[PDB]
Design a protein around this nucleic acid. Structure first.
Ligand code: CO
Ligand code: CO
Ligand code: CO
Ligand code: CO
Ligand code: CO
Ligand code: CO
Ligand code: CO
Ligand code: CO
Lengths: 224, 82, 142, 142, 226, 83
DNA sequence: CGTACTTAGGTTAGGCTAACCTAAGTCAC
DNA sequence: GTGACTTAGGTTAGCCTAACCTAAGTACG
């Protein structure tokens, strides 16, 4: 699937992995953007040459000040696009991320400033994710816990707060989550599970569903 | 077909006309677009097209808020109803 | 200046020249997109290979059935984007076209159908240019 | 040591092991070609994908109809090269195999036919190993 | 076709172009080995990194002492392979180059030394091309009197003796079968018909018949004029 | 097959045998191939295979020009016709 | 004497498969 | 414990198309 801008999508994938608390290896970029290991290293090398990132001792990718700034501007465009598509245009909830993943690469700062006024200074995306870099354009979340860790700790009732970009990429799953009512601002019951890499059962208001470990890891909640 | 280009109207001896279309070619020059808006050469507004003689000659137009000089390629890319 | 999509910008440039009543020669594309004559000849040959256009005897570029359909969908997205940027977002009149020239390459037909409803069945761009291919969109699930 | 052709050297290695009466496991290839176990599993999977071999329940590698045919043509070239290098060129008895192991990957069936006539219809290599697939060659334009 | 060894085939293509008196541009390598301009630049860059060649002011490729030595050892293996295939094995004249272009990448110095003895210290390939690097392995004739069929034709033509068919011409087996049929082969006389201007098909009359040679082909056939 | 492997002949109680085949596995050791040629373990030559007891024990052979010790994997990869 | 186009040689970004690696982790006996 | 594979994250060589460039032609009016 066409990235529109390869560089900006590498920067944003690193930013997504950080938000999800995943070590940003080149193998993560490879599996997410569906490219060969060589392509990723070759592209990561061009971005190191341009001075947007560096490779650390344990081979995890670190953003430079210019790289982080650029990564933030892309993520800001993405989430303002999602707000516009949901609040104003009225695009279906499950289709909004895929549209915004293209729009993020063509939106000027001039449109961003106009969208901030139109949308009334929004601070979160329609999937509960904070909108960064609003200061550059012109809340404590330390209590939030991941559905997998909650389940491994005995489960219980919790309020859905965030669905990460990773989960948004699968429109079928997002349609399923909306149906059963695993959406931001709704309460869910997380059933307990032992060990790791195990499917996690969750009961929403309208029904129940299973979340894969990497999915459940990317859904942040506030426990009762 | 009922619409006419500003350059042809000027060469034909000018006249009063309703601005209908500004082609994509003109829109690529923001500074020109600002000037066109300022003097009032915008869709729905009436303009006076001054008579011109020759080819590659600037076309003089009068809008509600003043006048401007259009280059031949610009005047060709603005369509009006006479 | 980044075209975002080379093929779509060649198709729309040929489309613009036809609307202006100018002969669409390779030299016109070279001027308007600020590329060398060799690049235009090469890209045109690639688009001729892919069945998007043909070259006539007088050497003027002609859009195929497939070429014209693609050109129309790009122009439809362009002019619906312009209407959104002026009427809803409130971007300045003179800055809208440059924004819409990037947006036209990333807008889905799904968004297009929502813009038709939002903007109340627009027939023209803010610059009075007719929106083509509106009947091609349909109403989807609505 | 450069294999020249990985596929042909995997096929001939499995062929060698069957001739020796040894169970052809991935681990045998790893030892003999001096590659990591992961490289062998990976290359074997490519060759299984391309229909050259299958893995049995006891995990021993089996050449398909297509795999055995390719293995036989490599071994035929190998043992005809050995006969040429000893009988005609006069390369030392102990150096011949290492030479023939490279030559087997570049010899055409056209040269093979000329070598059969030159060497007087050989049935074995200089080391007494039968030359397989001689009936597959034919006589060409003779 | 598969190059077997990319590096050795790049080195030998530069050597072939020098022997044919053609400026060795990356565009020449792209044509002959049928690869993209980017592929050639990327591969040439790897060989520059290894110190086998360098890019000159006019962007023509120059071999280093290591690169030239390696290029010579490949061309030696090639032409000793061609001798073996013709003289001993008896492979058809038109098919020998294609076989030799693969064998040149796998032949050891050990086999080269044995082939020199077997073939009786040959100095030329079966297509009349001198065999280099025989000294490195363990009286060369003055060839300054030799002229290219195209230059002879542009100078008014006339009778000449065929001496060399370059590696370039050998790549086309159908052309080589045609050359052999009409008798445009080393050690045979030909009548070269005169032509006006460059980039013109050159007519030649052999002992058994006549044929037309393309400018690049005629340029790659060396003769001694009556 | 009527052919037998040197390692199996040794374990059976040895004997005189005609060398028939040297597998590709053996040929990959030039130093071993030189020794095999020197002592006379080559196709068409007769050798004496000395009786051996157990597994992983080196096999002793006597050629026309002397004797050599074959490793089990080497002895397995040499095929003979027992007199 | 320009305008339109072709020719020749080249660069860059962004992809791919094949064929190797090291280094832990797992599995059947 | 041992041998036989799997997994996880890499590298390198050797290819590709698309989309640009400069420079110096030829073609035509
Ligand atoms: Co999103
Ligand atoms: Co994106
Ligand atoms: Co516009
Ligand atoms: Co555009
Ligand atoms: Co052998
Ligand atoms: Co081999
Ligand atoms: Co040759
Ligand atoms: Co070659």
């Amino acid at each position: 699937n066409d990235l529109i801008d390869t560089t900006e999508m590498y920067l944003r994938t690193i930013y997504d992995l950080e938000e999800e608390g995943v070590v940003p290896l080149r193998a993560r970029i490879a599996e997410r953007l569906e490219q060969s290991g060589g392509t990723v290293s070759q592209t990561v090398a061009r971005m190191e040459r341009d001075g947007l990132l560096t490779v650390a001792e344990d081979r995890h990718l670190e953003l430079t000040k210019a790289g982080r700034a650029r990564a933030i501007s892309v993520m800001r465009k993405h989430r303002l696009a999602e707000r516009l598509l949901v609040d104003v245009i009225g695009l279906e909830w499950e289709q909004v991320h895929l549209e915004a993943c293209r729009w993020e690469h063509v939106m000027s700062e001039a449109v961003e400033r106009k969208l901030v006024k139109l949308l009334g200074n929004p601070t979160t995306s329609p999937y509960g994710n904070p909108i960064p870099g609003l200061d550059e354009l012109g809340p404590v979340d330390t209590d939030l816990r991941r559905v997998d860790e909650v389940a491994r700790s005995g489960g219980g009732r919790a309020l859905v707060c965030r669905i990460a970009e990773h989960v948004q990429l699968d429109p079928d799953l997002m349609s399923e989550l909306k149906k059963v009512g695993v959406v931001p601002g709704n309460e869910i019951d997380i059933v307990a599970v032992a060990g790791v890499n195990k499917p996690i059962q969750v009961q929403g208001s309208e029904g129940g569903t299973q979340l894969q470990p990497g999915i459940a890891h990317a859904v942040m909640v506030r426990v009762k | 077909t009922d619409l006419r280009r500003v350059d042809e109207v000027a060469r034909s001896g000018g006249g009063r006309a309703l601005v209908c279309r500004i082609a994509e070619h003109v829109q690529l020059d923001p500074d020109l677009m600002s000037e066109l808006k300022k003097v009032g050469v915008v869709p729905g507004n009436e303009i006076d097209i001054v008579a011109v003689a020759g080819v590659n000659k600037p076309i003089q137009v009068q809008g509600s808020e003043g006048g401007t000089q259009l280059q031949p390629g610009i005047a060709h890319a603005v369509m009006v109803r006479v | 200046n980044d075209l975002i999509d080379t093929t779509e910008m060649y198709l729309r440039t040929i489309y613009d020249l036809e609307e202006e009543g100018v002969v669409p020669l390779r030299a016109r594309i070279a001027e308007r997109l600020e590329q060398s004559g060799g690049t235009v000849s090469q890209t045109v040959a690639r688009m001729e290979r892919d069945g998007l256009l043909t070259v006539a005897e007088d050497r003027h570029l002609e859009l195929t059935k497939a070429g014209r359909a693609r050109a129309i969908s790009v122009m439809r997205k362009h002019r619906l984007a312009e209407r959104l940027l002026v009427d809803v977002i409130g971007l300045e009149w003179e800055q809208v076209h440059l924004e819409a020239c990037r947006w036209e390459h990333v807008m889905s037909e799904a968004v297009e159908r929502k813009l038709v409803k939002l903007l109340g069945n627009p027939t023209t761009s803010p610059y009075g240019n007719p929106i083509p291919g509106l009947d091609e969109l349909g109403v989807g699930d609505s």
